[PDB]
Design a protein around this nucleic acid. Structure first.
Ligand SMILES: [Mn+2]
Ligand SMILES: [Mn+2]
Ligand SMILES: [Zn+2]
Ligand SMILES: [Zn+2]
Ligand SMILES: [Zn+2]
Ligand SMILES: [Zn+2]
Lengths: 162, 162
DNA sequence: TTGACTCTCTTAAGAGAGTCA
DNA sequence: TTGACTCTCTTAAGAGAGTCA
């Protein structure tokens, strides 16, 4: 809600509730042939999810609280960043999963960045494979690799140059 | 429907028309602090675009040919790949701009791959910066770099560990 | 047969808001 | 007030198909 005190109280209640989600250990590629361990705090698969939480999509949730007799609602991963600017360079700020695990709500696995920055982490080589993200990746992106390209650049005639 | 010879004739007509598009020389980052040059064959900004071409969206075009009284139509960048498989690993193949220039129709700047592989090239460090794409990038992706993250992972209490 | 427009759809990273009990 | 559902929207890489002359 409007007051900084009210916002801190929302963040604190959110953290307390998410802190009771089951902690699931995931072993993950870091890049460079190395492996690490992440501890994700995962929202349940089905109702009930926790005080204040409800599912609005297969992998989408919202957090809601009643303040001054009014309901206030947020995307479930946006709550840690309620005191941050909600845009950057004219682009909407988004909650970005460093662990690439949608159900996870561990704020130590989230950052707040443009949708382009967010998406791009899917292909990052990782913190031990050359990640250059200023807010560093926690793991190699799940889509990093050589790809599966069916056909490369080609011409039949002689009209084009690279 | 269309025979192999007829499909080859469609590709040849497409190449002959695109070959006459304005050729624009662009200096581009290759990764590793090096600069290279790409030559893009750019479809015009407004009609007329060239024989067989029409705009279906702000940055979308189609190629159309009528053969034996039947109208055939293709996405304007898909024509080089009409003799290739149209899916791989259960994913639809898409025309993917190695030059990251939508208006460009140079077939030496296109490859044919899943939409995820396609998107991922936006963040590639480039052919002289560590590209691991099996069909190699022609340039560093426009979105490669440290990013502009507004807020990183953080908690107010002590409920979480990474 | 052709040109120049029109419309909606896909994907996978993300969102907001309403209906009931 | 809190819970458990419903619906559609945004972005930026990509698509198919209709209408009229
Ligand atoms: Mn993400
Ligand atoms: Mn692309
Ligand atoms: Zn996590
Ligand atoms: Zn990274
Ligand atoms: Zn090009
Ligand atoms: Zn590459």
């Amino acid at each position: 809600a409007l007051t900084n005190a009210q916002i801190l109280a929302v963040i604190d209640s959110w953290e307390e509730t998410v802190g009771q989600f089951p902690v699931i250990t995931h072993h993950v590629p870091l890049g460079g042939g190395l492996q690490g361990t992440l501890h994700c705090y995962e929202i349940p698969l089905a109702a009930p999810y926790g005080v204040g939480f409800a599912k609005n999509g297969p992998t989408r949730w919202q957090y809601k609280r009643t303040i001054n007799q009014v309901v206030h609602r947020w995307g479930s991963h946006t709550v840690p960043f309620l005191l941050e600017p909600d845009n950057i360079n004219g682009k909407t700020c988004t909650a970005s999963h460093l662990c690439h695990n949608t159900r996870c709500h561990n704020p130590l696995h989230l950052c707040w960045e443009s949708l382009d920055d967010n998406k791009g982490r899917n292909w990052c080589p990782g913190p031990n494979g050359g990640c250059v993200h200023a807010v560093v990746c926690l793991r190699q992106g799940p889509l990093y690799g050589p790809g599966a390209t069916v056909a490369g650049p080609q011409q039949r005639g002689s009209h084009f140059v690279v």
